[PDB]
């Protein structure tokens, strides 16, 4: 094994490679949403900027996991990034709802990784997950939940969507 | 011919003169719209400021073509500038729709000028049109399309028009 | 069609969507290389830094094409991003040789898109390819070529590779 | 017992005192290495500076453990600091290999400390170990692994060792 590998279980190594792929997939979905909201027949620059930032954020999640893999002496094995399930995302509300669903799927996968890590007694990996991932996941789920509630209060369509979009820009 | 004239076909020279006139016409249309939106019974200062800037820009386009005619050794021949098709432009949406129609007619004329230039093997003129005109035209058509979409979302009339107009100011 | 679409052929729209996928694929290849060279048994941080910049660059090219698609009124279709077929890149020299091959494949695709745009008399699209893509692609190929020659002179393995890597930091 | 003591098991108290000693010992080993590389017949100032800073870091680790013991109301028990296992450390590569082995032994002891704290349900102590020790230990082992790989590429003896020394200085 690697000259640095210590207390690093193969199941944790494999699960991190899967998490890297999932993070990159979530980044690709948000990129799709970002440019969907800059279509001339959609034109929601606030939503676009929100998802463009989420897209950068999830790519840096993936990169932190790749760096982690190397830190522990595992092997990065990259897999194909699936195309987003949609190419057209609907109203701003439906995009937020699909985003909230994606964030909770990511959160679930992250909690399964934490359970794998505790089960193999890897305090370094559980710490990583708690400080670098689980905390941000709960914040973004709270933020997206808040946004859905406000957008339903404002609209969710027509003038209320137009105004709510402004608070994101 | 001029001491400077070289590889400058007569059809290209005449097309530039026609384009100058079309540019000045478009500037006159936007000047009409600009002050229409400052009527006391219209009172949309954001629309007025948007069209005022468009009027200055299209006059800058006409001057660049006049400067180009002289650079190449052609003769500027100015023609009468037609009065705008309208004196009253209706709602802000109707003004935007007529503007998008005008921008696409200018774009069509510019692509016809580019085809004339290509057919006469004038790389200096095709570069001019690509870098100084075709690019801004596409950006301008995209901007106006976005604004139509946002105004339909917000209004198009009543409070939503009042709020969208603020976005322009 | 789109309220903004004008002189935008269906084949150019489709070829732009394929180009987007190729840029994203090229970005993924360079991401693979960047973290390959941070493995504890490779430890080439200059190479890693060079390929990480290349990866960000390719992703910005993909986004410029997506923005372009929206400007013209076409529709972005995103497909799966294949993983690199071979992720054990070997020495730094072998990675540069693979990068040069990939850059030339991208260039050849970019030139076929230009021929499609020219065959369809789309001067706005050829201008985009010439100014935003073909110039940067030739400069990139020339740089990697230079790097290959310099590394073959320094090494290409052992102390010369170690010294050449510091020139990239 | 101390007025501040609470949920602090005597087995964790005793292990903290052992870890203090190991930290002081590792600090002593790096001090030996540092001044070994300043012998007139060795003269590797970069290596010397790297181990000096390493010696200062391990001493600080020992003091944070002593500060932690008092925080919890445990009692610091200091013992002899054993002589370093060697007086002469061979080549720069042999010094790094010995340092990598020592860091993995220290990491092993820290992980056993964590399992003792976990088995006694002391979350305050598992947090200390995760945030203050386990994280920097994995980073230090990765750092040293990279360095061994870099020095094997450069040298590991002769001009390559001389050149690698400069990157540490």
XYZ file of C-alpha atoms in Angstrom:
676
model
C 0.000 0.000 0.000
C 0.931 3.685 0.004
C 3.779 4.788 2.261
C 1.236 7.080 3.978
C -1.733 4.704 4.336
C -2.750 4.136 7.969
C -6.117 3.133 9.487
C -7.768 3.703 6.071
C -10.253 0.966 5.201
C -10.916 -0.085 1.609
C -14.668 0.459 2.049
C -14.044 4.051 3.077
C -11.700 4.533 0.096
C -14.343 3.190 -2.297
C -17.139 5.231 -0.717
C -15.137 8.458 -1.139
C -14.666 7.759 -4.846
C -18.435 7.383 -5.096
C -18.966 10.626 -3.179
C -16.596 12.435 -5.571
C -18.737 11.337 -8.497
C -21.929 12.418 -6.723
C -20.483 15.843 -5.883
C -19.496 16.376 -9.513
C -22.947 15.239 -10.638
C -24.576 17.782 -8.306
C -22.260 20.431 -9.739
C -23.396 19.512 -13.259
C -27.105 19.733 -12.342
C -26.596 23.225 -10.884
C -24.668 24.349 -13.965
C -27.632 23.163 -16.060
C -30.054 25.138 -13.894
C -27.778 28.199 -13.965
C -27.782 28.525 -17.729
C -31.428 27.442 -17.997
C -32.330 30.611 -16.079
C -30.392 32.748 -18.602
C -32.510 31.550 -21.539
C -34.108 34.559 -23.203
C -37.540 33.008 -22.497
C -36.770 32.452 -18.789
C -34.577 35.434 -17.813
C -34.207 35.034 -14.057
C -30.690 36.394 -13.384
C -31.006 35.966 -9.616
C -31.859 32.271 -9.818
C -29.076 31.909 -12.401
C -26.509 33.468 -10.071
C -27.712 31.346 -7.148
C -27.284 28.067 -9.030
C -24.014 29.162 -10.638
C -22.626 29.618 -7.121
C -24.012 26.263 -5.955
C -22.353 24.685 -9.005
C -18.931 26.082 -8.076
C -19.533 25.052 -4.469
C -20.267 21.399 -5.262
C -17.198 21.180 -7.537
C -15.044 22.350 -4.629
C -16.685 19.664 -2.474
C -15.537 17.143 -5.058
C -12.019 18.590 -5.126
C -11.752 18.490 -1.332
C -12.701 14.806 -1.463
C -10.073 14.142 -4.132
C -7.425 15.882 -2.040
C -8.615 13.840 0.942
C -8.204 10.606 -1.030
C -4.573 11.521 -1.750
C -3.948 12.622 1.864
C -4.969 9.204 3.146
C -3.068 7.263 0.478
C -6.116 6.016 -1.438
C -6.519 5.967 -5.214
C -8.804 8.446 -6.965
C -10.865 6.557 -9.552
C -13.042 8.991 -11.493
C -16.305 7.782 -13.028
C -18.465 9.201 -15.817
C -20.594 12.146 -14.741
C -24.235 11.489 -15.604
C -26.158 14.101 -17.551
C -28.745 15.956 -15.427
C -32.128 14.244 -15.267
C -33.674 17.361 -16.875
C -32.595 19.941 -19.391
C -35.534 22.288 -18.679
C -36.268 22.933 -15.033
C -39.708 24.538 -15.006
C -40.558 27.501 -12.806
C -38.151 28.924 -10.259
C -40.095 27.100 -7.556
C -39.769 23.706 -9.282
C -36.021 24.283 -9.666
C -35.728 25.049 -5.934
C -37.804 21.980 -5.085
C -35.618 19.760 -7.263
C -32.567 21.412 -5.666
C -33.880 20.685 -2.160
C -34.441 17.047 -3.160
C -30.870 16.840 -4.519
C -29.350 18.370 -1.384
C -31.109 15.813 0.820
C -29.929 12.939 -1.400
C -26.397 14.283 -1.026
C -26.930 14.640 2.726
C -28.171 11.040 2.925
C -25.147 9.757 1.028
C -22.907 11.786 3.364
C -24.524 10.299 6.480
C -24.047 6.799 5.037
C -20.374 7.621 4.485
C -20.167 8.752 8.123
C -21.709 5.472 9.275
C -19.227 3.526 7.162
C -16.405 5.566 8.727
C -17.568 5.139 12.349
C -18.079 1.426 11.718
C -14.422 1.141 10.684
C -13.239 3.410 13.552
C -11.824 6.166 11.340
C -11.982 9.353 13.434
C -10.090 11.314 10.780
C -12.782 10.617 8.175
C -15.730 11.258 10.524
C -14.171 14.619 11.472
C -13.762 15.547 7.792
C -17.409 14.722 7.137
C -18.677 16.651 10.175
C -16.641 19.843 9.687
C -16.435 20.042 5.865
C -19.670 18.477 4.598
C -22.485 17.675 7.048
C -22.453 21.231 8.414
C -22.653 22.916 5.013
C -25.296 20.401 3.878
C -27.672 21.295 6.721
C -27.100 25.019 6.108
C -27.894 24.767 2.382
C -30.994 22.624 3.044
C -32.205 25.273 5.543
C -31.439 28.081 3.075
C -33.267 26.344 0.200
C -36.213 25.586 2.463
C -36.384 29.271 3.464
C -36.316 30.270 -0.216
C -39.186 27.948 -1.153
C -41.303 29.409 1.662
C -40.539 33.017 0.641
C -41.159 32.292 -3.036
C -44.554 30.755 -2.230
C -45.340 33.813 -0.092
C -44.287 36.209 -2.865
C -45.791 34.286 -5.801
C -44.760 31.629 -6.698
C -45.287 32.901 -10.302
C -45.707 36.262 -12.029
C -44.768 39.438 -10.172
C -43.799 37.572 -7.000
C -41.293 35.442 -8.884
C -39.890 38.570 -10.528
C -39.416 40.298 -7.138
C -38.058 37.263 -5.288
C -35.531 36.738 -8.094
C -34.250 40.241 -7.301
C -33.352 39.304 -3.719
C -30.973 36.651 -5.113
C -29.064 38.958 -7.447
C -10.420 57.522 -57.197
C -9.016 58.559 -53.808
C -5.292 58.291 -53.189
C -6.155 55.827 -50.390
C -8.749 53.622 -52.132
C -7.678 49.985 -52.414
C -9.761 46.786 -52.736
C -12.938 48.818 -51.993
C -15.788 47.839 -54.310
C -18.478 50.298 -55.389
C -21.278 48.045 -54.097
C -19.672 48.005 -50.658
C -19.348 51.822 -50.708
C -23.036 52.230 -51.603
C -24.118 49.654 -49.005
C -22.241 51.554 -46.277
C -24.071 54.769 -47.213
C -27.385 52.937 -46.899
C -26.322 51.473 -43.553
C -25.399 54.950 -42.244
C -28.924 56.125 -43.037
C -30.478 53.079 -41.396
C -28.372 53.638 -38.275
C -29.502 57.269 -38.053
C -33.129 56.223 -38.569
C -32.869 53.731 -35.706
C -31.383 56.500 -33.550
C -34.349 58.717 -34.417
C -36.842 55.968 -33.486
C -35.208 55.527 -30.070
C -35.150 59.297 -29.524
C -38.898 59.302 -30.205
C -39.484 56.469 -27.733
C -37.241 58.129 -25.153
C -39.251 61.333 -24.926
C -42.563 59.493 -25.358
C -41.836 57.820 -22.019
C -41.341 61.241 -20.358
C -44.845 62.440 -21.251
C -46.738 63.345 -18.100
C -49.366 60.700 -18.953
C -46.773 57.951 -19.493
C -44.079 58.695 -16.875
C -41.725 55.710 -17.217
C -38.254 57.196 -16.585
C -36.489 53.823 -16.736
C -37.824 53.028 -20.189
C -36.979 56.614 -21.199
C -33.387 56.234 -20.034
C -32.989 52.856 -21.737
C -34.177 54.213 -25.087
C -32.181 57.433 -24.705
C -28.992 55.377 -24.358
C -29.995 53.227 -27.334
C -30.473 56.428 -29.365
C -26.934 57.621 -28.536
C -25.497 54.180 -29.325
C -27.092 53.943 -32.762
C -25.832 57.433 -33.633
C -22.349 56.285 -32.592
C -22.826 53.366 -34.992
C -23.669 55.775 -37.801
C -20.580 57.874 -37.089
C -18.318 54.811 -37.055
C -19.625 53.930 -40.516
C -19.069 57.498 -41.673
C -15.511 57.334 -40.341
C -15.080 53.993 -42.115
C -16.255 55.393 -45.458
C -13.535 58.063 -45.224
C -10.866 55.556 -44.078
C -11.455 53.482 -47.212
C -11.633 56.434 -49.599
C -15.349 56.346 -50.292
C -17.723 59.309 -50.441
C -20.256 59.771 -47.646
C -23.606 60.593 -49.260
C -26.206 61.373 -46.611
C -29.894 60.791 -47.273
C -33.018 62.133 -45.586
C -33.799 60.505 -42.235
C -37.372 59.182 -42.282
C -39.686 60.149 -39.451
C -40.314 57.300 -36.980
C -43.142 54.979 -37.981
C -45.024 56.039 -34.815
C -45.397 59.091 -32.643
C -46.935 57.129 -29.757
C -45.539 53.760 -28.789
C -48.190 52.309 -26.486
C -47.212 50.259 -23.462
C -43.644 49.629 -22.405
C -44.042 46.083 -23.717
C -45.206 47.316 -27.134
C -42.222 49.683 -27.276
C -39.887 46.763 -26.457
C -41.523 44.555 -29.083
C -41.127 47.221 -31.759
C -37.508 47.739 -30.636
C -36.698 44.031 -30.955
C -38.257 44.089 -34.433
C -36.075 47.088 -35.367
C -32.926 45.462 -33.977
C -33.515 42.364 -36.091
C -34.057 44.461 -39.246
C -30.761 46.255 -38.606
C -29.150 42.865 -37.966
C -30.545 41.517 -41.250
C -29.233 44.554 -43.126
C -25.828 44.120 -41.467
C -25.672 40.443 -42.493
C -26.560 41.478 -46.051
C -23.715 43.981 -45.908
C -21.411 41.186 -44.687
C -22.463 38.951 -47.577
C -21.808 41.748 -50.074
C -18.387 42.255 -48.459
C -17.555 38.524 -48.562
C -18.639 38.248 -52.191
C -16.305 41.104 -53.114
C -13.414 39.630 -51.047
C -13.073 42.603 -48.686
C -11.618 41.179 -45.450
C -11.207 44.639 -43.924
C -14.954 45.295 -44.225
C -16.042 41.845 -42.972
C -13.801 42.289 -39.894
C -15.393 45.698 -39.238
C -18.905 44.251 -39.351
C -18.055 41.251 -37.163
C -16.164 43.159 -34.473
C -18.053 46.472 -34.425
C -21.626 45.611 -35.425
C -22.719 41.966 -35.596
C -21.568 41.308 -32.026
C -23.330 44.276 -30.408
C -26.464 43.527 -32.462
C -26.753 39.974 -31.103
C -26.070 41.203 -27.549
C -28.704 43.911 -28.054
C -31.319 41.456 -29.375
C -30.655 39.102 -26.422
C -30.984 41.955 -23.890
C -34.306 43.117 -25.366
C -35.620 39.553 -25.492
C -34.732 39.150 -21.787
C -36.555 42.401 -20.939
C -39.702 41.353 -22.801
C -39.716 38.060 -20.864
C -39.184 39.808 -17.497
C -41.860 42.418 -18.242
C -44.379 39.725 -19.213
C -43.504 37.967 -15.932
C -43.796 41.141 -13.840
C -46.737 42.760 -15.647
C -46.893 43.555 -18.515
C -49.142 46.434 -17.264
C -49.974 48.071 -13.935
C -47.802 47.450 -10.891
C -45.504 45.026 -12.713
C -44.690 47.629 -15.353
C -44.074 50.197 -12.608
C -41.604 47.839 -10.875
C -39.805 46.624 -14.017
C -39.341 50.269 -15.080
C -37.405 50.784 -11.819
C -34.994 48.005 -12.823
C -34.043 50.113 -15.869
C -33.425 53.375 -14.027
C -38.550 29.375 -32.338
C -36.878 31.807 -29.956
C -37.830 35.484 -30.150
C -34.097 36.231 -30.576
C -33.136 33.591 -33.124
C -31.842 34.883 -36.465
C -29.509 33.275 -39.022
C -28.734 30.451 -36.546
C -28.779 27.110 -38.339
C -29.902 23.939 -36.560
C -26.589 22.203 -37.370
C -24.567 24.957 -35.706
C -26.778 24.717 -32.610
C -26.226 20.932 -32.508
C -22.472 21.223 -33.112
C -22.253 23.785 -30.289
C -23.874 21.294 -27.906
C -21.314 18.640 -28.905
C -18.495 21.180 -28.418
C -19.785 21.932 -24.900
C -19.515 18.247 -23.990
C -16.007 18.039 -25.424
C -14.843 21.069 -23.402
C -16.323 19.565 -20.229
C -14.629 16.281 -21.061
C -11.307 18.056 -21.623
C -11.831 19.770 -18.265
C -12.363 16.386 -16.592
C -9.196 14.916 -18.130
C -7.129 17.814 -16.758
C -8.774 17.496 -13.335
C -7.734 13.837 -13.324
C -4.140 14.795 -14.138
C -4.034 17.621 -11.574
C -4.784 15.358 -8.619
C -2.816 12.450 -10.073
C 0.292 14.604 -9.666
C -0.523 15.283 -5.987
C -0.445 11.601 -5.038
C 2.189 10.969 -2.382
C 4.077 8.614 -4.745
C 4.100 11.129 -7.638
C 4.585 14.500 -5.900
C 4.872 16.834 -8.904
C 3.165 19.987 -7.573
C 4.153 22.164 -10.538
C 2.545 19.708 -12.948
C -0.504 19.509 -10.676
C -0.831 23.305 -10.661
C -0.474 23.521 -14.452
C -3.143 20.872 -15.098
C -5.482 22.393 -12.487
C -5.343 25.719 -14.319
C -5.952 23.936 -17.615
C -9.027 22.261 -16.088
C -10.551 25.544 -14.913
C -9.806 27.013 -18.341
C -11.614 24.218 -20.199
C -14.633 24.643 -17.910
C -14.719 28.375 -18.712
C -14.665 27.506 -22.433
C -17.650 25.198 -21.872
C -19.555 28.009 -20.112
C -18.766 30.541 -22.841
C -20.324 28.124 -25.355
C -23.373 27.662 -23.131
C -23.743 31.427 -22.829
C -23.331 31.644 -26.601
C -26.089 29.090 -27.157
C -28.470 31.213 -25.096
C -27.417 34.437 -26.871
C -28.359 32.991 -30.253
C -31.604 31.424 -29.017
C -30.494 27.799 -29.295
C -31.120 25.282 -26.533
C -28.385 23.769 -24.350
C -28.494 19.966 -24.303
C -26.089 18.521 -21.717
C -24.923 14.910 -21.972
C -22.771 12.633 -19.843
C -19.118 13.508 -19.291
C -17.014 10.394 -19.876
C -14.219 9.698 -17.431
C -10.682 9.602 -18.864
C -10.141 6.135 -20.322
C -6.688 5.939 -18.671
C -6.160 7.632 -15.306
C -2.637 6.339 -14.516
C -0.898 9.094 -16.428
C 2.651 7.865 -15.766
C 5.507 10.392 -15.939
C 5.080 14.128 -16.421
C 6.306 13.774 -20.003
C 3.603 11.177 -20.791
C 0.970 13.453 -19.270
C 2.130 16.355 -21.446
C 2.045 14.137 -24.533
C -1.518 13.083 -23.727
C -2.427 16.743 -23.116
C -0.994 17.751 -26.495
C -3.006 15.008 -28.229
C -6.190 16.098 -26.431
C -5.569 19.770 -27.319
C -5.166 18.865 -30.989
C -8.369 16.806 -30.882
C -10.177 19.825 -29.437
C -8.623 22.056 -32.094
C -9.723 19.730 -34.889
C -13.245 19.732 -33.483
C -13.149 23.542 -33.194
C -12.083 23.779 -36.857
C -14.888 21.467 -37.999
C -17.366 23.673 -36.136
C -15.857 26.664 -37.950
C -16.355 24.944 -41.309
C -19.982 24.216 -40.405
C -20.457 27.880 -39.425
C -18.828 29.076 -42.672
C -20.817 26.627 -44.796
C -23.925 28.114 -43.181
C -22.806 31.752 -43.684
C -22.920 32.509 -39.957
C -20.291 35.252 -39.514
C -21.190 35.809 -35.857
C -20.293 32.196 -35.053
C -17.023 32.122 -37.022
C -15.983 35.323 -35.239
C -16.663 33.659 -31.879
C -14.603 30.608 -32.812
C -11.710 32.676 -34.151
C -11.549 35.167 -31.282
C -12.471 33.040 -28.236
C -11.294 29.534 -29.142
C -8.908 29.071 -32.076
C -6.461 31.707 -30.810
C -6.299 30.271 -27.301
C -6.052 26.729 -28.704
C -2.977 27.448 -30.876
C -1.287 29.279 -27.984
C -2.024 26.339 -25.684
C -0.668 23.788 -28.180
C 2.477 25.878 -28.683
C 2.996 26.119 -24.908
C 2.665 22.365 -24.343
C 4.984 21.707 -27.277
C 7.546 24.034 -25.675
C 7.108 22.285 -22.325
C 7.694 18.882 -23.935
C 10.926 20.070 -25.555
C 12.148 21.643 -22.290
C 11.384 18.518 -20.254
C 13.090 16.254 -22.798
C 16.137 18.541 -22.457
C 16.080 18.691 -18.651
C 15.374 14.977 -18.231
C 12.728 13.691 -18.965
C 12.984 11.600 -15.740
C 14.901 11.946 -12.478
C 16.524 15.266 -11.581
C 15.414 17.035 -14.759
C 11.783 16.179 -14.102
C 12.193 17.408 -10.515
C 13.788 20.656 -11.735
C 11.329 21.197 -14.605
C 8.430 20.723 -12.176
C 9.659 23.722 -10.147
C 9.551 25.861 -13.315
C 5.791 25.241 -13.396
C 5.081 26.242 -9.791
C -10.365 14.856 43.068
C -9.923 18.296 41.493
C -12.777 20.781 41.842
C -13.052 21.012 38.031
C -12.900 17.299 37.210
C -15.972 15.873 35.470
C -16.443 12.800 33.237
C -12.633 12.423 33.114
C -11.575 8.781 33.388
C -8.265 7.876 35.030
C -7.314 5.781 31.962
C -7.596 8.860 29.775
C -5.600 10.811 32.373
C -2.823 8.194 32.291
C -2.777 8.010 28.490
C -2.558 11.802 28.158
C 0.591 11.673 30.329
C 2.057 8.964 28.100
C 1.252 10.959 24.969
C 2.949 14.013 26.520
C 6.108 11.953 26.897
C 5.966 10.625 23.331
C 5.551 14.178 22.034
C 8.577 15.397 24.027
C 10.553 12.407 22.732
C 9.637 13.105 19.104
C 10.669 16.724 19.693
C 14.047 15.449 20.944
C 14.508 13.177 17.913
C 13.919 16.113 15.529
C 16.329 18.286 17.508
C 19.000 15.616 17.096
C 18.276 15.429 13.350
C 18.314 19.216 12.963
C 21.803 19.681 14.371
C 23.056 16.510 12.676
C 22.366 18.248 9.342
C 24.511 21.228 10.471
C 27.669 19.139 10.939
C 30.515 20.451 8.787
C 30.642 17.057 7.020
C 26.861 16.988 6.324
C 25.877 20.627 5.669
C 22.239 20.350 4.569
C 20.748 23.625 5.880
C 17.306 23.002 4.370
C 17.008 19.609 6.046
C 18.268 21.211 9.269
C 15.639 23.970 9.125
C 12.866 21.460 8.358
C 13.653 19.307 11.405
C 14.146 22.360 13.678
C 10.616 23.533 12.919
C 9.462 19.915 13.363
C 11.126 19.885 16.786
C 9.375 23.129 17.780
C 5.999 21.779 16.582
C 6.267 18.557 18.625
C 7.199 20.561 21.733
C 4.080 22.708 21.225
C 2.022 19.521 20.862
C 3.370 18.385 24.244
C 2.423 21.680 25.896
C -1.118 21.585 24.499
C -1.432 18.135 26.073
C -0.174 19.488 29.404
C -2.558 22.438 29.158
C -5.341 19.958 28.374
C -4.515 17.812 31.423
C -4.850 20.817 33.760
C -8.067 21.955 32.028
C -9.700 18.622 32.862
C -8.296 18.507 36.391
C -5.917 15.660 35.645
C -2.403 15.754 37.065
C 0.646 16.064 34.813
C 3.175 13.282 35.455
C 6.478 13.905 33.665
C 8.966 11.066 33.076
C 12.390 10.747 31.504
C 12.751 11.710 27.852
C 14.598 8.793 26.270
C 17.705 9.374 24.195
C 17.005 9.470 20.448
C 17.357 6.039 18.861
C 20.332 7.298 16.787
C 23.095 9.880 17.029
C 23.907 9.915 13.291
C 21.007 9.778 10.845
C 22.710 8.819 7.571
C 21.533 10.452 4.369
C 18.755 12.988 4.043
C 16.557 10.207 2.692
C 17.266 7.923 5.674
C 16.401 10.793 8.004
C 13.076 11.328 6.206
C 12.263 7.593 6.289
C 12.924 7.466 10.047
C 10.792 10.609 10.466
C 7.945 9.033 8.470
C 8.128 5.946 10.704
C 8.108 8.058 13.896
C 5.114 10.089 12.671
C 3.188 6.890 11.933
C 4.033 5.545 15.407
C 2.811 8.804 16.929
C -0.326 8.602 14.779
C -0.894 5.032 15.975
C -0.640 6.146 19.621
C -3.013 9.078 18.979
C -5.574 6.712 17.408
C -5.290 4.404 20.425
C -5.799 7.441 22.657
C -8.957 8.225 20.671
C -10.302 4.677 21.069
C -9.700 4.857 24.842
C -11.492 8.229 25.010
C -14.316 6.877 22.858
C -14.634 3.711 24.949
C -15.026 5.882 28.050
C -17.538 8.255 26.392
C -15.389 11.379 26.622
C -16.475 13.527 23.660
C -14.466 16.540 24.825
C -11.292 14.457 24.532
C -12.204 12.875 21.169
C -12.779 16.399 19.847
C -9.352 17.521 21.091
C -7.709 14.537 19.411
C -9.583 15.034 16.130
C -9.117 18.795 15.789
C -5.690 19.333 17.367
C -3.749 16.145 16.664
C -5.169 13.624 14.186
C -5.610 16.276 11.498
C -2.063 17.654 11.644
C -0.639 14.129 11.941
C -2.183 13.024 8.634
C -0.928 16.266 7.010
C 2.597 15.756 8.366
C 2.746 12.143 7.113
C 1.487 13.219 3.660
C 4.094 16.061 3.604
C 6.933 13.678 4.459
C 5.717 11.091 1.955
C 5.773 13.718 -0.805
C 9.298 14.730 0.267
C 10.643 11.159 0.119
C 9.151 10.782 -3.372
C 10.623 14.143 -4.460
C 14.072 13.280 -3.104
C 14.060 9.849 -4.745
C 13.237 11.596 -8.029
C 15.884 14.286 -7.590
C 18.588 11.977 -6.207
C 18.491 10.644 -3.548
C 22.252 11.366 -3.252
C 24.660 13.821 -4.852
C 23.463 16.800 -6.865
C 19.833 15.773 -6.408
C 20.168 15.802 -2.630
C 21.974 19.146 -2.844
C 19.189 20.548 -5.067
C 16.336 19.127 -2.961
C 17.886 20.705 0.159
C 17.326 24.159 -1.375
C 13.570 23.650 -1.601
C 13.401 23.107 2.180
C 15.417 26.239 2.987
